[PDB]
Design a protein around this ligand. Structure first.
Ligand SMILES: Nc1ncnc2c1ncn2[C@@H]1O[C@H](CSCC[C@H](N)C(=O)O)[C@@H](O)[C@H]1O
Length: 222
């Protein structure tokens, strides 16, 4: 089930032919209005870009522009799926060569910070063996006013990630942590994109980057 301005069923046969013709498959979890996923599709035509988000109405503006003709900015290799990651359909299982969570909010953000099974399993479910997971979080959300979904949780830092046992929880659910770091002055354009913000603005923010590799699950501490 996905979008073409309207909300329709996707032909399973069209799904296999698209994946097979793709040089690479990239799944973005939590795309907002999916301008980020759209820019990537344009920048890489040979990639099959898959944006997944429960708020499907939020990504209709992108769905319209991507539905246009190549001469007017159409992106045929863009697939915007209406779904939550904890209940991702079986058609998206193990199809991604790369999974990215960029500037998450709500259930996805809280699930990542806490290391909840439902979210982490869903993220792992869509990835192929060896696929990289890229989580990027702006650290300004731990400055008042702090969003409701995280205002009862201490700030997530490179040190906190291992102390709270997030490293071992990720590894147990199939994500082997490769790198955790803060990258200050990260240009917000390179991770975040909505049709409300113009490019080349120059807005920066300290970003918590978390990189992992899809491995076999059930791998806990002793
Ligand atoms: N459990 C969940 N699974 C998948 N997506 C979720 C989710 N909980 C929240 N989201 C989505 O994640 C989105 C974050 S807004 C971020 C948009 C984009 N990454 C950008 O930087 O521009 C929200 O629109 C919300 O709909």
């Amino acid at each position: 089930v996905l979008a073409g301005k309207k909300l329709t069923d996707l032909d399973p046969d069209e799904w296999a032919k698209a994946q097979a013709s793709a040089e690479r498959i990239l799944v973005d979890v939590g795309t907002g209005d999916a301008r980020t996923a759209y820019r990537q599709a344009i920048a890489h035509p040979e990639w099959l870009v898959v944006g997944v988000d429960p708020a499907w109405q939020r990504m209709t503006e992108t769905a319209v522009r991507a539905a246009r003709k190549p001469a007017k900015g159409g992106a045929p290799n863009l697939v915007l799926v209406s779904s939550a990651i904890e209940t991702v359909p079986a058609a998206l299982h193990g199809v991604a060569d790369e999974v990215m969570v960029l500037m998450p909010w709500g259930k996805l953000l809280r699930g990542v910070v806490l290391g909840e099974a439902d979210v982490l399993s869903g993220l792992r479910a869509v990835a192929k063996p060896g696929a990289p997971l890229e989580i990027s979080i702006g650290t300004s959300i731990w400055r008042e006013p702090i969003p409701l979904e995280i205002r009862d949780l201490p700030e997530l830092t490179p040190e906190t990630v291992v102390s709270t046992g997030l490293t071992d929880r990720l590894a147990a659910l199939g994500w082997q942590v490769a790198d955790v770091r803060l990258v200050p002055h990260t240009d917000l354009d390179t991770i975040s994109s909505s049709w409300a913000r113009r490019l080349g603005s120059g807005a920066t923010e300290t970003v918590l980057h978390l990189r992992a590799v899809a491995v076999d699950p059930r791998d806990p501490v002793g």
